[PDB]
Amino acid sequence: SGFRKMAFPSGKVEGCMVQVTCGTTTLNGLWLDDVVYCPRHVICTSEDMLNPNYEDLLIRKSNHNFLVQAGNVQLRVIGHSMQNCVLKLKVDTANPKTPKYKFVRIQPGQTFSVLACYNGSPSGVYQCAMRPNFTIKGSFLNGSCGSVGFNIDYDCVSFCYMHHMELPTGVHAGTDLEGNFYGPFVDRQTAQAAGTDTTITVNVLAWLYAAVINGDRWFLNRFTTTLNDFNLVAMKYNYEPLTQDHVDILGPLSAQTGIAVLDMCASLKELLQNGMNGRTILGSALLEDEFTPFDVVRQCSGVT
Amino acid sequence: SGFRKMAFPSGKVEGCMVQVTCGTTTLNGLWLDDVVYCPRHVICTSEDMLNPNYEDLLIRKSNHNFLVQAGNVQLRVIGHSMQNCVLKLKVDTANPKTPKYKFVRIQPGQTFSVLACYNGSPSGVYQCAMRPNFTIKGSFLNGSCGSVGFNIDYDCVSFCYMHHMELPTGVHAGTDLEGNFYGPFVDRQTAQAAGTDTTITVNVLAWLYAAVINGDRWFLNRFTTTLNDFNLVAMKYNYEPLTQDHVDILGPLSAQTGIAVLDMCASLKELLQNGMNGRTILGSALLEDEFTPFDVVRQCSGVT
Ligand SMILES: O=C(c1cncc2ccccc12)N1CCN(c2cccc(Cl)c2)C(=O)C1
Ligand SMILES: O=C(c1cncc2ccccc12)N1CCN(c2cccc(Cl)c2)C(=O)C1
């Protein structure tokens, strides 16, 4: 028992982190096979970041201007290209520590682990969700650009995020490993609207099921509701509308607890309408939405 | 910016996890150099765990009865001994992945990362604190015994905890790497009182400093307090008394924010007396106490 914001073990990703320097700028790169992936803004100077013409900026750069260092050893850059907002630096050596990997674009509401890195060296690992507004509420300081988000399926690492930017609001924006930004964000030092951030309803319900499995059952009531009645309540509280696909995904959790999804919805409705009254659920005084139904089942079944 | 419950990157520890089997019991072991460390209750059967005589039980066991597997390969056991509540199984092969390490007994209120493991395979990593009542609020299922807690200082791994037991209350108890239990717990399936769990005051203050650095400043007030006046309030709310050693440790955080420790104490006093009023601090609706002053400075400075 117990419920914690658990991240995947980070070893397979630590062995991929390198430091990339271009001109005066240093950030992190991801070395997989003979390619180092990094944010393209590594080629920018502070005077360029207001409105950079990356194509023109990249033209003034040659292979030898990209310094890639893996631990203490320098990697030889034999090719460079820009794919959307990432640079791909071809090196002459395949990373011997390259795990089995995939590049995936995650859906909003899905979770992933972030290995925060500085100067190509890992500093920490934490779990987070891609928000419905395509931002992440990470923990990143200067030099963390190029740090990646990932998921692990047994031996395969699915990389889903590369850190690029911190918005003036303190939230983070970045790309998938093909360089496509999640959300409407651009790699430009300009004011950018993140958008209204709603609560991931299917995840809150999964976490309520986790609470029931863990003995926290005070919030359970004698009521039920309908998908449409529940969604009227969810709209008022900026919660994502619950669909039958969401109810289907909560099936194993509903079966394990013997609590119908709509009965749990009625408990959530009452919690939204009445608050916690100073009580806690799984050590929290607010409704947690960064655990998917898969995460709850994983943490409650022990998949390694 | 951003503040997350960050764990150390787990790679150095993942390379140390092995599976230990004895009779019908399987749990995790920690392989460092030519020694595998594991909870001694691996030698027990379910009929023995009510009141086991470990010395008598261990007598019926020989080297060949301890099955140690590192990934897919079997390790040859050439020696076995009991040190307090851990067994040390000498194997004929030094772990080639042994990092620079130390065994340390942590103080209550200190934090550490846990690499939860099953069948010698890592499943997740999370950060936690040793509670003042010497329990940990972890996330562990059947088969997680032998999973370890650690800290990383650049390249050196300081192992501080080995998981042994889940109390009937859902909290966890275990030992340091010399087999000495944290707290009064015994490795016996008997009812054991955890004791009153107080709040780590120095950690809550560190987290309030983290909040101020991150822009969350609503809780700051026009008041100050004294150590004795504050401690009267801390006693009422089951908070650890704040000492001048604690004030000294908050020095760098006080200097970075320009907020005197006693002024932050007065903010904490008002938060204890008045509650949050439905507001949040660093995305939380309760006062967080599992971040030490060192953790706050580390997460706000980027030590790799
Ligand atoms: O290194 C960071 C950085 C990253 N993450 C969190 C931080 C918190 C405090 C200070 C700096 C950071 N930068 C530089 C690049 N940079 C940027 C600016 C404009 C566009 C692009 Cl693509 C990128 C940043 O936003 C900020
Ligand atoms: O494997 C676990 C275990 C571990 N952690 C969390 C769990 C959550 C659900 C079910 C089982 C566990 N056990 C077996 C040993 N065991 C024990 C019983 C008495 C004494 C000793 Cl030292 C140990 C346990 O407490 C429980």
Side-chain angles (χ1 to χ4, degrees):
Chain A
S1 73
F3 218 70
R4 282 259 184 220
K5 196 66 68 71
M6 200 183 276
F8 286 104
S10 53
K12 287 159 185 305
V13 181
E14 295 167 46
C16 296
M17 308 307 307
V18 298
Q19 176 192 91
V20 186
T21 296
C22 190
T24 70
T25 310
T26 286
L27 42 62
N28 305 285
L30 183 69
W31 183 23
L32 288 165
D33 300 325
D34 59 355
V35 179
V36 165
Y37 302 83
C38 78
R40 66 175 177 175
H41 73 257
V42 71
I43 74 180
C44 296
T45 68
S46 282
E47 330 102 26
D48 279 314
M49 287 259 53
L50 281 171
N51 193 37
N53 194 309
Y54 288 99
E55 294 81 6
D56 289 356
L57 287 175
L58 195 55
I59 281 170
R60 299 289 171 213
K61 303 298 180 188
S62 297
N63 291 333
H64 73 261
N65 294 138
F66 290 110
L67 301 172
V68 183
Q69 198 176 322
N72 200 56
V73 304
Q74 208 72 19
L75 305 183
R76 185 179 300 279
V77 178
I78 58 162
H80 71 271
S81 61
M82 187 161 61
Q83 172 175 21
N84 303 310
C85 303
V86 299
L87 302 183
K88 294 188 297 200
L89 309 178
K90 197 199 181 169
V91 293
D92 68 343
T93 305
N95 183 358
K97 298 192 198 168
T98 309
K100 282 180 165 170
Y101 74 94
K102 273 177 174 179
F103 290 169
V104 297
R105 188 172 175 86
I106 55 163
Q107 294 292 302
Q110 293 301 124
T111 61
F112 61 95
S113 298
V114 175
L115 179 66
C117 288
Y118 297 91
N119 298 100
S121 289
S123 56
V125 59
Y126 55 87
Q127 185 72 355
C128 72
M130 173 58 60
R131 300 308 308 170
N133 70 358
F134 291 107
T135 64
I136 80 166
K137 291 168 189 177
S139 178
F140 289 118
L141 308 178
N142 179 60
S144 65
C145 299
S147 297
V148 300
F150 60 96
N151 280 280
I152 305 174
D153 199 336
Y154 177 54
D155 59 346
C156 185
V157 178
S158 292
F159 293 101
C160 61
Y161 175 82
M162 176 162 277
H163 185 53
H164 286 242
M165 217 163 47
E166 181 173 286
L167 299 170
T169 53
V171 298
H172 305 107
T175 73
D176 62 27
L177 276 291
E178 297 190 318
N180 301 113
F181 264 96
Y182 283 99
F185 311 109
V186 287
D187 46 0
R188 219 165 296 185
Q189 193 186 298
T190 190
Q192 302 179 42
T196 305
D197 192 31
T198 65
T199 305
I200 310 142
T201 312
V202 70
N203 289 10
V204 174
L205 287 173
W207 171 89
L208 288 171
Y209 277 113
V212 168
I213 303 173
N214 280 242
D216 275 22
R217 306 155 62 93
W218 67 264
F219 56 86
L220 298 180
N221 63 34
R222 308 180 160 275
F223 323 138
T224 197
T225 188
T226 76
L227 262 185
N228 284 193
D229 173 55
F230 177 75
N231 291 337
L232 283 188
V233 181
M235 193 153 58
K236 187 172 133 76
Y237 291 96
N238 302 90
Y239 263 64
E240 224 111 70
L242 199 78
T243 66
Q244 186 58 51
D245 287 3
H246 292 146
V247 179
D248 288 347
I249 296 166
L250 297 153
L253 287 175
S254 174
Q256 203 182 321
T257 59
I259 296 169
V261 176
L262 295 174
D263 290 8
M264 190 67 92
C265 287
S267 283
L268 177 54
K269 170 176 154 182
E270 291 308 304
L271 286 171
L272 294 179
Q273 292 170 346
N274 300 298
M276 320 253 309
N277 283 99
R279 295 188 284 265
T280 61
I281 298 172
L282 286 175
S284 177
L286 46 74
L287 299 164
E288 300 286 331
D289 80 340
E290 299 201 352
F291 290 109
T292 65
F294 295 81
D295 294 340
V296 170
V297 162
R298 191 187 302 110
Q299 191 168 168
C300 302
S301 96
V303 186
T304 67
Chain B
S1 73
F3 218 70
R4 282 259 184 220
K5 196 66 68 71
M6 200 183 276
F8 286 104
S10 53
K12 287 159 185 305
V13 181
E14 295 167 46
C16 296
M17 308 307 307
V18 298
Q19 176 192 91
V20 186
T21 296
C22 190
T24 70
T25 310
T26 286
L27 42 62
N28 305 285
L30 183 69
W31 183 23
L32 288 165
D33 300 325
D34 59 355
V35 179
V36 165
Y37 302 83
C38 78
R40 66 175 177 175
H41 73 257
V42 71
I43 74 180
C44 296
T45 68
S46 282
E47 330 102 26
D48 279 314
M49 287 259 53
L50 281 171
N51 193 37
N53 194 309
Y54 288 99
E55 294 81 6
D56 289 356
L57 287 175
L58 195 55
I59 281 170
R60 299 289 171 213
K61 303 298 180 188
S62 297
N63 291 333
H64 73 261
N65 294 138
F66 290 110
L67 301 172
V68 183
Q69 198 176 322
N72 200 56
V73 304
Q74 208 72 19
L75 305 183
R76 185 179 300 279
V77 178
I78 58 162
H80 71 271
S81 61
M82 187 161 61
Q83 172 175 21
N84 303 310
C85 303
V86 299
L87 302 183
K88 294 188 297 200
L89 309 178
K90 197 199 181 169
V91 293
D92 68 343
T93 305
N95 183 358
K97 298 192 198 168
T98 309
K100 282 180 165 170
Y101 74 94
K102 273 177 174 179
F103 290 169
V104 297
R105 188 172 175 86
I106 55 163
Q107 294 292 302
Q110 293 301 124
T111 61
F112 61 95
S113 298
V114 175
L115 179 66
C117 288
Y118 297 91
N119 298 100
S121 289
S123 56
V125 59
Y126 55 87
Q127 185 72 355
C128 72
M130 173 58 60
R131 300 308 308 170
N133 70 358
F134 291 107
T135 64
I136 80 166
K137 291 168 189 177
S139 178
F140 289 118
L141 308 178
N142 179 60
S144 65
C145 299
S147 297
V148 300
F150 60 96
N151 280 280
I152 305 174
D153 199 336
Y154 177 54
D155 59 346
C156 185
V157 178
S158 292
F159 293 101
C160 61
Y161 175 82
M162 176 162 277
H163 185 53
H164 286 242
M165 217 163 47
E166 181 173 286
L167 299 170
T169 53
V171 298
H172 305 107
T175 73
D176 62 27
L177 276 291
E178 297 190 318
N180 301 113
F181 264 96
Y182 283 99
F185 311 109
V186 287
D187 46 0
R188 219 165 296 185
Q189 193 186 298
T190 190
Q192 302 179 42
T196 305
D197 192 31
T198 65
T199 305
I200 310 142
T201 312
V202 70
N203 289 10
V204 174
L205 287 173
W207 171 89
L208 288 171
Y209 277 113
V212 168
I213 303 173
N214 280 242
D216 275 22
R217 306 155 62 93
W218 67 264
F219 56 86
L220 298 180
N221 63 34
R222 308 180 160 275
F223 323 138
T224 197
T225 188
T226 76
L227 262 185
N228 284 193
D229 173 55
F230 177 75
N231 291 337
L232 283 188
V233 181
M235 193 153 58
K236 187 172 133 76
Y237 291 96
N238 302 90
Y239 263 64
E240 224 111 70
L242 199 78
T243 66
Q244 186 58 51
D245 287 3
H246 292 146
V247 179
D248 288 347
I249 296 166
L250 297 153
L253 287 175
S254 174
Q256 203 182 321
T257 59
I259 296 169
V261 176
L262 295 174
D263 290 8
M264 190 67 92
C265 287
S267 283
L268 177 54
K269 170 176 154 182
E270 291 308 304
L271 286 171
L272 294 179
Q273 292 170 346
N274 300 298
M276 320 253 309
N277 283 99
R279 295 188 284 265
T280 61
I281 298 172
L282 286 175
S284 177
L286 46 74
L287 299 164
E288 300 286 331
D289 80 340
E290 299 201 352
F291 290 109
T292 65
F294 295 81
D295 294 340
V296 170
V297 162
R298 191 187 302 110
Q299 191 168 168
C300 302
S301 96
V303 186
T304 67

